[PDB]
């Protein structure tokens, strides 16, 4: 029973990518013995100060900022080892969504 | 009860700010209420668009988080560990961190 499947059950979701009308797309990556949550929240900036700002945010945040391989957007990230329990996964998901909403504020 | 960071220091055979040098790798710690953060400043903070975007992309693929320190002086590799973790998880985490940063630095720094 994969951690991803574990999270879904914990969330009550019955999937046979998770999109929420909060204008949020969550992608899951289960490679490297871990569960990674990813959410592209805005286009990749070309401004030095803005880029440094997101790297600074990574110094103190549980939810970190990265850039997709396609180099088209900044993505909020959060990883957990597959060995994690369904309770830890659930908690991680809750924290992730809250931070993504925060990142989209202005 | 001794704090988790103090127990790590003991495990590292150590008896206040502090900088560790393990195999040429610099490691210092930051703390918050619920988290102990291991930090390795591995190179000066780049000031060009492309290198900065590159490190943001690396964040997506690298096992360890890459960020910039508070003074905007260095690019830093880091690992967050719950202040509720066991002494052993702290030590093992520290060792794995060093291992990850060593390779990160030699390939991207």
UniProtKB/Swiss-Prot annotation, chain A:
- InterPro entries recorded for this chain? T3SS_chaperone (IPR013095)
**Entry's CDD domains?**
T3SC_IA_SigE-like
Alphabetic keyword roster: Chaperone, Cytoplasm, Virulence
Indicate yes or no for the key word Cytoplasm: yes
Chief location:
cytoplasm
Which cellular compartments is it found in? Cytoplasm
User: Which Pfam families is this protein grouped with?
Assistant: Chaperone_III
Q: What GO cellular-component annotations does this UniProt entry give?
A: cytoplasm
Induction is noted as: Transcriptionally regulated by InvF and SicA. Also regulated by SirA.
Provide the assembly information: Homodimer or higher-order oligomers.
Q: What does this protein do?
A: Molecular chaperone required for SopB/SigD stabilization and secretion.
Give the family this protein belongs to, as stated in its UniProt record: Belongs to the IpgE/SigE chaperone family.
Protein name as annotated = Chaperone protein SigE
Organism, per UniProt? Answer: Salmonella typhimurium (strain LT2 / SGSC1412 / ATCC 700720)
């Amino acid at each position: 029973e994969s951690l991803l499947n574990r999270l879904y059950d914990a969330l009550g979701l019955d999937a046979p990518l998770l999109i929420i009308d909060d204008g949020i797309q969550v992608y899951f990556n289960e490679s490297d013995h871990t569960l990674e949550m990813c959410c592209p929240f805005m286009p990749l900036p070309d401004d030095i100060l803005t880029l440094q700002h997101f790297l600074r945010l990574n110094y103190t945040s549980a939810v970190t900022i990265g850039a997709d391989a396609d180099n088209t957007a900044l993505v909020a990230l959060y990883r957990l080892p597959q060995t994690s329990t369904e309770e830890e996964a659930l908690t991680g998901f809750e924290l992730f969504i809250s931070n993504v909403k925060q990142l989209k504020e202005h």
